[PDB]
């Protein structure tokens, strides 16, 4: 594998080992073959195989919009989807796109009933809205599980979040918007302004 950008040269030199220092570098993480060495423990799951099509003069174009979400079950998770003529190349392109979009989300115990403080649930209440699908990340008591959907359980188990209550608004049929709104909520987890004394 030939690194191409400055981040690839830095990771091949050994200066950047984990993705946190790469994000601290501030450069664009464009090569899919950098995060695999930075995080060899990356895991992902295909979230749907919804087969799109398209109209032509003679026949009908066919593609696959398979989406795969990537996390590490510790506090890092990312979103990524891709399409191509075959399910294999489509899912592999989605895996390439997802690993470039991994982010670090800080976690704790902000539940009204839970009082542990050790990171097992969302730090506080946040929202994720991709399309009309919206998800609120209300904290949950420890040792309880995710009070969300099956794809929500997959995405939040990839992201490392353990116990959460949620709620869904709008047309929840689109699994792609469900994954993207969960991503938006997790990104709003670590963007709200916290007190300096906390």
């Amino acid at each position: 594998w030939v690194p191409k950008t400055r981040l690839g040269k830095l990771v091949v030199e050994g200066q950047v080992a984990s993705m946190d220092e790469a994000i601290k570098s501030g450069l664009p993480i464009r090569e899919p073959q950098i995060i695999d060495m930075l995080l060899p423990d990356l895991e992902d799951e295909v979230l749907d195989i919804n087969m799109v099509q398209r109209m032509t003069d003679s026949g009908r174009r066919v593609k696959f919009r398979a989406t795969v979400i990537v996390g590490n079950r510790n506090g890092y998770v990312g979103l990524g989807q891709a399409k191509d003529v075959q399910v294999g190349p489509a899912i592999r392109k989605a895996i390439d796109a997802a690993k470039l979009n991994i982010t670090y989300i800080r976690r704790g115990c902000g539940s009204w009933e839970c009082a542990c403080g050790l990171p097992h649930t969302v730090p506080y209440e946040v929202t994720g809205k991709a399309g009309s699908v919206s998800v609120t990340l209300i904290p949950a008591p420890r040792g309880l599980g995710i009070a969300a959907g099956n794809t929500a359980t997959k995405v939040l188990e990839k992201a490392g979040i353990k116990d959460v209550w949620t709620k869904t608004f709008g047309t929840t049929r689109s699994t792609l918007n469900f994954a993207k709104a969960t991503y938006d909520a997790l990104n709003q987890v670590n963007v709200v302004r916290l007190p300096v004394y906390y």
């Binding site: 191409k4 950008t5 450069l27």
Partner: protein, 190 residues
């Protein structure tokens, strides 16, 4: 002022545009009767000195300089030769900083824009990659996705040559680079 205000009056630097913006009020000191609003020349030299202090913290071969106008084209090339900075005078490819497989690929650390409104694509590309940019606005410019503002007339040939020579000499003195270029080199061929 490091250079006398009479020189800025003569060189056309203080001439702006008949219409100004509300965010450019802080760099304007007085409305002229003609319509063209004169900028703050002391503020212009202050911004130039602050940018040269900021540009002196980095090597010239990591800086990026872009320009679009013909009148800003020659002094941009003079800046690129006198510093070694990779300039993009003339037409600009939209995917130079991004698009690693494209010709003209670059991974800078600071961006310089000769005119922020005209060089909008470079501003969007720098904002996408996340590179702070020292810009060169005018009386009818907005500083969106701009880190540092240089209030000078970018539509005057003499003003552009004088401002580019001032920035070049200021940076080259701050970073102890040998600067043997003179303003006639940066002056546009008349």
């Amino acid at each position: 002022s490091l250079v006398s205000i009479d020189e800025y009056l003569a060189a056309g630097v203080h001439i702006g545009t008949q219409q100004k913006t509300q965010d450019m009020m802080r760099f304007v000191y007085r409305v002229r009767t003609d319509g063209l609003y004169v900028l703050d020349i002391q503020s212009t030299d202050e911004r130039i000195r602050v940018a040269s202090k900021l540009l002196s913290h980095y090597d010239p071969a990591r800086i990026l300089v872009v320009s679009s106008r013909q009148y800003g084209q020659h002094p941009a090339r003079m800046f690129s030769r006198a510093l070694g900075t990779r300039a993009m005078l003339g037409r600009f490819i939209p995917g130079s900083l991004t698009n690693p497989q494209i010709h003209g690929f670059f991974e800078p650390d600071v961006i310089i824009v000769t005119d922020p409104a005209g060089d909008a694509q470079v501003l969007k590309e720098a904002s996408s990659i996340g590179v702070p940019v020292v810009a060169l606005c005018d009386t009818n410019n907005l500083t969106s996705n701009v880190d540092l503002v240089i209030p000078t007339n970018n539509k005057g040939r003499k003003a552009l040559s004088l401002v580019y020579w001032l920035l070049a000499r200021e940076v080259s003195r701050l970073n102890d680079t040998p600067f043997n270029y003179e303003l006639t080199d940066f002056e546009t061929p008349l």
